[model samples]
Target: GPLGSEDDLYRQSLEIISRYLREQATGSKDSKPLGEAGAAGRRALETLRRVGDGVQRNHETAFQGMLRKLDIKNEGDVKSFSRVMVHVFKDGVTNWGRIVTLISFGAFVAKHLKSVNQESFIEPLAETITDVLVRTKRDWLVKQRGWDGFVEFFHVQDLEGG
Candidate 1:
């Protein structure tokens, strides 16, 4: 065990993730909302604003976990992190559902930041989520689709179901 391998580290970063998914890559993530929140979406924007802080806190905790686990201190690890993240993207086609959630949550965080321009941390957090998704999709498109399938396969409407 060379401490943290790049692949696992990249995945774990996405694993902000286990904050709710509480499982693995093989299983679909089922992240729930606050204090038995019956319907987070049905609530008013004001109500959700209060709720947003909780989610932001949860995300912060998860991000911290990712950092502690990575323990990347040198330039080499940083380079490997990018290369390994490419691998996460290379597999993005199969994880579109989780990918969308990451994107949505990232956007939600940004919305809160826009409304209150006080905390800048939200920007970096949102950036990391979408950045990972973008890079992942690109990797999959360049490798699996263009280089291999090359129009042989196509994406349909979509379904994220149980």
Candidate 2:
């Protein structure tokens, strides 16, 4: 914490983003309440938010010139959990959006598998989801598969169980 530092603003911005992501994430489906999964969800979301935000500031980054890509405006589908995938494509998905979907999905996994050791998880939660989407290349599966698909993806990958 420093005087006149963007750190505070940045951190504050992120907190709101995750809050919105989680709020919308749970409300959109029968996913676990924030009480069950919030800490882990926040940790994971905050982790990615940090990385994504950094990339957003760098114009030369692989995401190149996509600084605004990570910008989260006011909530309610503006940056809602489901809208994360809405940008995917009429028949495709985004690398960043997929990651957002994964993070949201991971929050739920953290909830359901209460006994799972968070640290033991050795794989990225969305690898399977990403693989399927890459191969499928159709409409948003999250929309297509719904909550069952959300849980199944994480369960199959044992994402939060690790």
Candidate 3:
């Protein structure tokens, strides 16, 4: 069931969004107005969460339809799918919220990372957190979804460059 192409696509989309958020948080660009970058980061995360929720809802519907098509009338069967759905939705939403928080905190740190009076440890900690986010996103989401799935979702037209 996990190998279903649609399921793979859904998972890959989630992974890409996670990676993109982490990259945006760690970006060095500061051309935007003060706090604008953080706002943009939050907006991007919210968009991802909305998209993920939509996909998850679709997956749940499809899963129930499959059960119906199979004539599986057992309440236990429906309950099992419902349980998994709850877990998936909760995990996705909670992780997205955490990312938003981290981005906001990171933005504040960025604003003061270069101040002469700021603690040297803060910048390094921010970098470390960014690195951890990237690594966790890759290992947990990308690896779980598979490299081919990641490429298929992110690559443009199967070309070398997009």
Q: Quick one: best lDDT, which candidate?
A: 3
Q: For candidate 2, list the clashing residue pairs, or say none.
A: 120-162, 121-162
Per residue, candidate 1 scores C-alpha lDDT tens digits across 1-162 of 656743433332333322322221112333544332122221312232333345546667654443344433332234433433444335524654333334434444344334454234443443455346545565554454321231123122253344
Error of 1 at 57 (Å): 19
The weakest ten consecutive residues by lDDT in model 3 span 71-80
Higher-lDDT candidate of 1 and 3: 3
CA lDDT of 153 in candidate 1?
32
Any idea how many clashes model 3 has?
0
Error of 2 at 48 (Å): 8.8
Model 3 Cα lDDT, one tens digit per residue, 47-157 = 433443454354556444433443212322333333323333345543543433333333333333333234344434344444444444554444544334323343343
Q: What residue pairs are clashing in model 3?
A: none
Alpha-carbon lDDT, every model: 0.38, 0.35, 0.39
Which ranges of candidate 2 are over 4 A from the true structure? 1-64, 68-87, 90-145, 157-162
Worst 10 residues of 2 by lDDT: 119-128
